């Protein structure tokens with residue numbers, strides 16, 4: 001069972017229900033959906049909401 | 056922030072501080088290089104504001120601060136301080152010259168209305184600011200941060216004489232001791248989603264900072280996302 005209501009479709013950020021018991025994941029502005037179809041990778045130098053300075 | 060910790064440099068790179076007649080009087084968050092989101096009770100058309108991004112210690116030059124002038128103030132169209140200084144308590148500030156985004160000056164993410172609400176429902180967010188570190192006490196020099204849990208609606212209604220409408224939420228601890236405070240208003244309440252922070256609230260008010268039985272009151276950002284996105288589109 002794969003739906004957005006179950007573990008967010010395993011999407012890191014956003015999930016949309018699609019055809020045939022599948023989901024389509026997506027990300028906020030400045031990120032790209034990764035080749036694994038679930039994760040969100042930066043697509044700009046300083047994407048939103050990320051800590052980049054060494055802590 | 057009462058009961059918080061010093062942020063490290065670049066730990067909350069979306070945080071800004073506002074300066075006006077009084078310096079460091081409210082917080083805000085970077086929406087994009089030209090727009091800040093804050094509380095409407097902090098600002099007013101005509102009163103000159105400057106924004107400082109990349110700030111950490113307000114008393115030391117750390118070579119990451121970017122100061123910008125505010126050229127337009129957009130309180131939410133439903134804000135009316137004569138009725139209630141704290142309802143629809145949100146405003147946008149347009150900067151004169153864009154910020155230079157970098158590791159110290161980075162926008163906060165803003166999800167759609169549905170997901171901003173889902174993220175608030177996760178039940179744990181971070182607040183940050185240079186406000187008072189004790190009720191009626193001194194303000195912070197170094198940016199403070201604190202994790203606050205969402206408080207269920209019934210508990211928060213039973214804790215105050217004021218009506219808390221559905222476009223607000225409460226957060227804090229049953230024992231008090233950890234809360235936002237005066238001077239933190241307008242700053243962010245953010246939820247971390249797999250290492251990416253999303254804006255889930257605007258710090259608004261409370262009755263007595265960190266007092267046991269009282270909570271911090273926040274503006275639900277989900278109710279205003281469409282308006283933020285429309286107004287700040289570049």
Ligand SMILES: Cc1ccc(O)c2c3c(nn12)CC[C@@](C)(NC(=O)c1ccc(-n2cnnc2)cc1)C3
Pocket residue numbers: 141217234235236237238239240258259260261262263264265270271272
């Ligand atoms: C941001 C915040 C978080 C938590 C806080 O306890 C806090 C305070 C203030 N801001 N503040 C202002 C001074 C302080 C004494 N509060 C207030 O002076 C205060 C009093 C009344 C209201 N109010 C009126 N109608 N609706 C709400 C709002 C604020 C404490």
Ligand SMILES: [Cl-]
Pocket residue numbers: 031032033
């Ligand atoms: Cl993509």
Ligand code: NA
Pocket residue numbers: 110111112113114115116117120
């Ligand atoms: Na500084």
